[PDB]
Symmetry: C5
Subunit: 326 residues, 5 copies
């Protein structure tokens, strides 16, 4: 055939380690354009982001060079990567033990050595999450690419000439805002410098799950605690009501802890509000016990009325402070 | 022997990278028919679907050709895939890090190059699930196959001529309705175009587990809350009963949060009903507190009777709104 | 040496793809008998069965043939499978992504071509569980083996001449009853026919863990629920005691749903009894509420006495209905 | 160099399948001594033991034979296992799907063919646990090694001549008692026999975690239940206190069931004590209900005093029955 | 080209097993410098530490040598590890089944044989954690490297000449203090001796999650317990309040046990304080029961006043003893 002849005549002595350059001092302008097609998940327990995407490689090759006119056209040939040279561009903060690939076993070539190896992969990266806004958070994550082994003296990791990648991959759990990728000059040491590509993915949470699971039960428990001071001390249910709120707040705290991650910086607003209704319960149990001991003149009516007013105004201001996020 | 000499004569210089076509401009008509023999699971926590099945490959081969009359019949020979050409048809939204195979190490051949590579695999795909009807939902799943590396200019990914695949794989947990596969012409970019095969599996949930675990306790707590307004204010148990319902609703909310997935769009109907009975408990506890403070003329009888009637009508209408699904 | 000489002389041109037969129309009589030496687990959550065992392969080989008389005896030679032909017999409903092996890297040979390859493996299969009797169930499991690629026209998958495998692998968690293997002729399509070997493992549950965790607390909660009607209505404890039973039943339902699997058909007996004690606490709370509102002539004594009699007889008859299983 | 000359001159025709013996009837005396350097864990949920260690191989080799006198000394050469013959000695109850290795890629050799391959591995084995004494248990586990493929007619799996391996690997979670390895002749069938090596590791639980998490709360709730009969029937708190104990024992039962394994033989002592205190709560709630029923002559004082005495003596005798273990 | 001919001329007969030394008695001075760039996690459940980093390997190579002057410069060439010699330096207490690598498939070489292999890896090691100060702890962990197969007679595992690695890679969950690495001479046996490089990472916990989820609810439950002696015995709520505290403490214990690791030595301070609050509730319920029995002259007022004083001083002193950690 003809493709077999081309493979025989252009993979004669092509070692998979030799740098595909003519002049040793010259480098190869390896391009890159990473695209995320679907974000899988963002687990804050281990600060892992799992996003499905494809990485667009493109580099010139001095050794791969053939003319189509004598070889009957055939301007598109597909070569597996195991037989041609390959850049070592990998994601720096990969979560997986090994950097895995999907259909990264075949790369197209052109007559002017213009390979377009495009692996697809489930990138598992690390990003910092600011849970101060949690769950109404906008934790932007970063995907980073580059070569750990060789540096700018070997390859010039550059961005694609056409960077029309202003896409919005809207999902059912997150809304994704793509950020135009940039190039930064990494410095392994003082003498030598490396190259790197940064891309940004801004995640805005649009799922109702966390609101329904935390905000509604917590605010409604705060609602019952707001009505705590009304029960008369002699009813023998005031302290029982308070301890019931203790149990309910403890259950909500256990659930939130089961959900909210261990590796945390500042406390989330929902966790703070749950803690704050918990101390609400503590303080108004203090006042209920004081009132019942004093009952056995009865001026406790003014006391718990002003107490109710103070808790109304302070709880509503903390609630609006929390709501200002959304 | 005969098979050994046939292998020697037909694998002389068959590289595993060369496209098996005579004319370079011509393509190879690769067929496909995916069949699901047993669905394993559908985990909505990560929107993953695990289904066991086999995928049927069929393509003509120009190079592999022999006459059986001189070679003593032998119309069926079994060749491992590592020695012959192979299409890169893969599932687009694979959940696994790598696209794994089961007994995809041997493919049959015919004298007119008519290979029948039939891998078996545990396909792990992604689905979009409308949790509104959950658990009485019909979350359809799609399995999509195609070639990421090479495109229509290389292969024509086409459906089987005989598509009698109207089967129903009825399981003990899901009712599976097969959908006749379709072919869609994927467009990687404006200049180049690709091919793809999409199949559908409609999943009907027939498991008693979910409604037993959620609907029964939730409607039961709704029943108990419905009876709350009879408890006299002076009995010192109405508030205790209400806080007991608070604790029960909190426990049901914890179970729902543990089971119902985080990656959620609209709220499920069972979650809505649970939140609705939870705010029910809030409101009728408010009325109980107002009644007990007003007790210490006693018109609360008419008040809680009309209250009970209003909650009868609204609880029955929300319950029948839920039941309209089933 | 002599073993190296034999290997050089009898593995001259032995490709690992050629069918080891003299006449092409003739097939090779591959024997098989799977033996389970220790069952690991049976997880009903994903219908997975993990059993450790060994699979006995035995097939004649036309090509491998030498006389020991001129080769100084030596009737026992060990060959790794990577260099000899191997049947593709695999388990049809494997749960693992790939069909893995243990010490399946060496197979013995005889002078009259009687290879006795015996892999050991952790078989991970699928079972259908009739959990109506759960936990006092007898969920039988089936292990099925055969060749997906090649069929009866290639190999005759048969049982061993002697099938004395009537063993009982009694464990500390399961009673294992082996079933003699059977051969069934699988039909991939109308024109072609395949072969398969099925074996059965009857699993009796002898563990006390599930009993102690579910039946004892459930029946004792039902016991307390039975005593609820004796509490006088005016004691302000009947409603509190009833809601305490409601919370206890809710917690027990949480733990049961945590343990009992999602992929379910008919409801298990313990789950039915738990739902039934939920109904119990609901109904007797209804009657207690009616009694307390009616208290404010007091004929409720006859009412709750006949109520206790009716509920005692129905609870004991349902309890003996459950006990009839064990 | 010189080591390259050794490698060229001793790996001339070294096949990795030939048995390293001169006379075919003779066997090779393969020695072994497994050593555990750090036990990772013992999970009773799946009866798995994860222990880090190294396994010591030692066998004579006929083909490796060279004298240092003409070869400039060099008594120490390191050979990777891929080019040298190795025995198939593998753990008989391996828990992993495949038998994994750590730095089992290089083995030393001597001039008198005395290969000393010493792999390191995380052995994941199966052992039987007597949960009766749990947590104050001494569940000894066994590691068993041998050759599944070939038998005593091929290798004589023997123990090290110097077996001074009476070490104590004391950890922060388990007390490890080493047991001298023994050799047994495994019988695959009646005609042929195999070989095997047993080592024993006795695990004494010295952790305080299980005591603090189960014994303390269970005995403490038992302490509260012991004081239940003092509460007067008319105080309207005896029944509420009893149901609070019901909820407490239910919570401890849930957490214990979450921790205690499913694959269980006889009931653990802590589980038995928890069941005992739970039926304690049932019985004394029965007596409280009867006392309040007769409350509405009051001879109940003698009744609950003698009840307190009898249940105190039986509580303390069961407690000392538990304490006899520790 | 030039790199291709250099590779042909310098990988003529370079086996990947021969020690790269001229004199057999001489050793090769393999250097090492480990760097941790980002700690992932420290899971005390299995005493595992996951830290992302890179390992700096550097060794002389006698065979690998060229003169750049006649080879047109080219002072740095990139070579994959599969074709050159490699040290077997690995982490001694690796948690993973196999020692995995990231981009450890390419190593640079210099003209004076100064290979500078720099693998990157997710080190999963074992370290001892002193849970006494937990969560306000400083549990140091150790990473250790060395050669299990060959010893000092083969390689002199030395530390980097420039050890300016005094970096503080502070994260959002742990404050990381690097410790300058040291060299220790491991002794496999009496006759032979090995080498090893040890480095230390001091991990200070700065996360707010742990104290927020444990100490705050625990200290506030102790606070609520402290108010208990005020409730009058005749109010029929003191026993109910106490049993509510018992249930809350039981829930808190269940949550802590879910979080606190099983592999434990000394009890953590938070767990001890929780045990103290159980003792709190038990003792004050005992006194409450005694007071209510004695109520039916009333000198109990002095009793619970002095009880409050004694328990307040004991709780405040244990609280300040706990706070002395932070
Ligand atoms: C790499 O490309 C950038 C793009 O502007 C250029 O500034 C830089 O000089 C290039 N470096 C090399 C070594 O080619
Ligand atoms: C592929 O097959 C479809 C089936 O009708 C046909 O319409 C299309 O033209 C074919 N394309 C090529 C490139 O053969
Ligand atoms: C396979 O063996 C069975 C055993 O009786 C026999 O009935 C059948 O004819 C055999 N088939 C072939 C193709 O040898
Ligand atoms: C193996 O060694 C044991 C050690 O005493 C010996 O009793 C036995 O006879 C040996 N067997 C063979 C086949 O060498
Ligand atoms: C290894 O290096 C250390 C560094 O001082 C030195 O003390 C020791 O003697 C060396 N050993 C060998 C065998 O070179």
């Amino acid at each position: 055939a003809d493709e077999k002849r081309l493979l025989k005549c252009i993979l004669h002595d092509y070692d998979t380690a030799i740098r595909p350059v003519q002049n040793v001092s010259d480098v190869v302008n390896v391009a890159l354009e990473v695209t995320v097609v679907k974000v899988i998940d963002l687990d804050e327990k281990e600060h892992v982001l799992t996003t499905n995407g494809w990485i667009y490689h493109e580099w010139n090759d001095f050794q791969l060079k053939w003319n189509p006119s004598d070889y009957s056209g055939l301007k598109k040939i597909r070569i597996p990567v195991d037989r041609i040279w390959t850049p070592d561009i990998v994601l720096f903060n990969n979560a997986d033990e090994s950097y895995r690939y999907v259909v990264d076993k075949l790369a197209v070539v052109y007559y002017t050595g213009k390979v377009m190896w495009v692996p697809h992969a489930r990138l598992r990266s690390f990003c910092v999450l600011d849970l101060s806004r949690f769950p109404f958070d906008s934790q932007m994550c970063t995907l980073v690419f580059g070569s750990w082994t060789h540096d700018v003296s070997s390859v010039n990791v550059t961005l694609r000439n056409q960077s029309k990648v202003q896409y919005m991959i809207d999902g059912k759990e997150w809304q994704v805002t793509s950020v135009q990728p940039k190039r930064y000059q990494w410095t392994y040491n003082s003498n030598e410098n490396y190259a790197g590509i940064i891309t940004g993915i801004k995640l805005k949470r649009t799922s109702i799950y966390y609101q329904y699971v935390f905000i509604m039960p917590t605010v409604l428990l705060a609602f019952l605690t707001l009505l705590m001071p009304f029960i008369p001390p002699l009813g023998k249910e005031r302290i029982t009501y308070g301890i019931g709120l203790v149990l309910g707040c403890t259950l909500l705290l256990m659930m939130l802890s089961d959900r909210m991650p261990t590796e945390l910086g500042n406390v989330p607003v929902v966790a703070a509000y749950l803690a704050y209704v918990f101390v609400m319960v503590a303080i108004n149990l203090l006042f209920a016990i004081m009132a019942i001991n004093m009952s056995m003149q009865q001026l406790t009516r003014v006391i718990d009325r002003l107490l109710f007013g103070s808790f109304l105004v302070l709880t509503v201001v903390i609630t609006i402070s929390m709501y200002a996020h959304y």
